[PDB]
Amino acid sequence: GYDRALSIFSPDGHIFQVEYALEAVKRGTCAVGVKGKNCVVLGCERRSTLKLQDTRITPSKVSKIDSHVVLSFSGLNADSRILIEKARVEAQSHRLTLEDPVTVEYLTRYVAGVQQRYTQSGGVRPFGVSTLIAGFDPRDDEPKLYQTEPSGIYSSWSAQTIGRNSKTVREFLEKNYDRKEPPATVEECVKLTVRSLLEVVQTGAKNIEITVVKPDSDIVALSSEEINQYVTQIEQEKQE
Amino acid sequence: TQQPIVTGTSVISMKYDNGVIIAADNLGSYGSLLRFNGVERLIPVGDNTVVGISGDISDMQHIERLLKDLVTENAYDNPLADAEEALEPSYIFEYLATVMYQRRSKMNPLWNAIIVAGVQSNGDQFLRYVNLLGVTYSSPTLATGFGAHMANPLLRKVVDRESDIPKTTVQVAEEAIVNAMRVLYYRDARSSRNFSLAIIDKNTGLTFKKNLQVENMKWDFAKDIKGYGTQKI
């Protein structure tokens, strides 16, 4: 078998293949995650260079791992499918052996472990993907939002963004998001998520995707018209 | 798992004051057929050890090759192969015992009973048994097959415990072995008159005697035995 060490250290103590995998994430479309008091919202960018697309059948950016957990990403699209599949398998495997669905932290730890394994295995390159994993633990009403990256490190976030122009939207969230009092309702949380994407997206038409996840496996994806109403309200308030 | 085909019968042995004696007949039986009359079942290893083997002859020949190969391997990169780092009886036995137990553990045994007789570097007598099951034991007298039932009782009258070993000379010990071989020829239906005997002494070394025969047999009284009870003529 092909055993070649592709991910290796350099004189300055860097693993370039892992760092170049982050550059692939930097190229990817923007993804954002914001958690409220009783909800989490995942926002995603759709680049409008691709028109004449069939939005019914085109792979959606936000993927369900289980009925209570979701995964969005920035980076290579093909690579993301492999992580999502493994995660979905592990979710069912956990239910089978532990007789309880995965916690969001556990699912994140697994996905992050897979990414890490690909940074010190022979004959493989790292995943060019960073993920945002969000949801609610079984029988728990506390919102959860985690991030992973090609190196394999993971951590929890009150709010976070990844992908192209993520530096700008992270700047927005850092001043607008208050920890002492987060978005109390679903509306407030979605509004803040759409606002943060509007700093980068360009047009607020079919370029913004929103997915709301609530406790007890209550996940729903917003339509074009529903999102367009948020876009209208934000700009009308801005004209002042 | 197999069955033994061509087989060798008893191997008998005992310790004496300055060494050990071992003996075995020259027959290779094929069931009830006394097929091969010139089979050597005592195999010397160096000038200080003799391995006596009973049971399956094809497996005996395999073991013979293993020992021959052991001497070759010991000589490799060994300037003291004919001195301090020569093969000892204890080394040769433990090797065989390892093999026998390994083979029984794979359910494919070497169908043999083996007695390793010899003298160690420090002059100590070595005599130990091992068989197809990997079972091992030592005793002042050791015997396989029918020998266990008929030879041991006779040899144990000479050396009954450890303290009787220094009191037993080579002449007395050899006499007991030769007598035991005669008794086996009287009573073992798969034995032969012709046998080999080996003495390993700490002073006079290895003496290997071939083409010995059972002699001074009592048969004359047979003429007086008539019928099976009431018959007179």
Binding site: - | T1, G134, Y137, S138, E162
Partner: protein, 222 residues
């Protein structure tokens, strides 16, 4: 068909004292109705103040003891010459035995020594690794003859105090090393009388804080 198991007879006995422990075993080795050896050592010093015996099928018995002695050696290498405690040895032996669960070592194993508080300890095993610490245990061919005698004379079972008539039990006073050796010798003499696979000689290993001492006694040779 080839039968990979055999029965080499013999019998072993472990007794735990207050600050000592003994492991005894007869020196006879047999197959069927023949004697192989009148003196074939069966109880072994395995280092770290632990004595061991694996009675039943001698080939498996020797293999196990050999592997445990090996385990003691590698325990020193891997853990900075640390002394292997009797409880740790017992657990290790369970894994050696259960490792061959589907092709067992056909033996009844007993180990003896001192625990980490300096008190006498005896551990007993079945062929497939089940074990248990005990104050008293006989194993092997004549175990059925000896154990009841030990229940009576070591643990004072079915014994009460005169005058009270079944109300007050006999108090469980401790036994000295001289008192234990008397019970061991009588156990084997009695077993020798009624069991054909027991006889020739008795070898006792006594374990104390000072080390491992040996004692040998003659038994009937018929």
């Amino acid at each position: 068909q080839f039968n990979p198991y055999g029965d080499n007879g013999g019998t072993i006995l472990g007794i735990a004292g207050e600050d000592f422990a003994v492991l005894a075993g007869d020196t006879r080795n047999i197959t069927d109705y023949s004697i192989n050896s009148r003196y074939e050592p069966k109880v072994f010093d395995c280092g770290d103040n632990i004595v061991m015996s694996a009675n039943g099928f001698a080939a498996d018995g020797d293999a196990l003891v050999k592997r445990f002695k090996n385990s003691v050696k590698w325990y020193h290498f891997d853990h900075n010459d640390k002394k292997l405690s009797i409880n740790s040895a017992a657990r290790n032996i369970q894994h050696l035995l259960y490792g061959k669960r589907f092709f067992p070592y056909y033996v009844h194993t007993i180990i003896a020594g001192l625990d980490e508080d300096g008190k006498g300890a005896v551990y007993s095993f079945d062929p497939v690794g089940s074990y248990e610490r005990e104050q008293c245990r006989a194993g092997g061919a004549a175990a059925s003859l000896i154990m009841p005698f030990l229940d009576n004379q070591v643990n004072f079972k079915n014994q009460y105090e005169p005058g009270t008539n079944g109300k007050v039990k006999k108090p469980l006073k401790y036994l000295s090393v001289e008192e234990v050796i008397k019970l061991v010798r009588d156990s084997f003499t009695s077993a020798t009388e009624r069991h054909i696979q027991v006889g020739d000689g008795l070898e006792i290993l006594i374990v104390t804080k000072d080390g491992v001492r040996k004692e040998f006694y003659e038994l009937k040779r018929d």
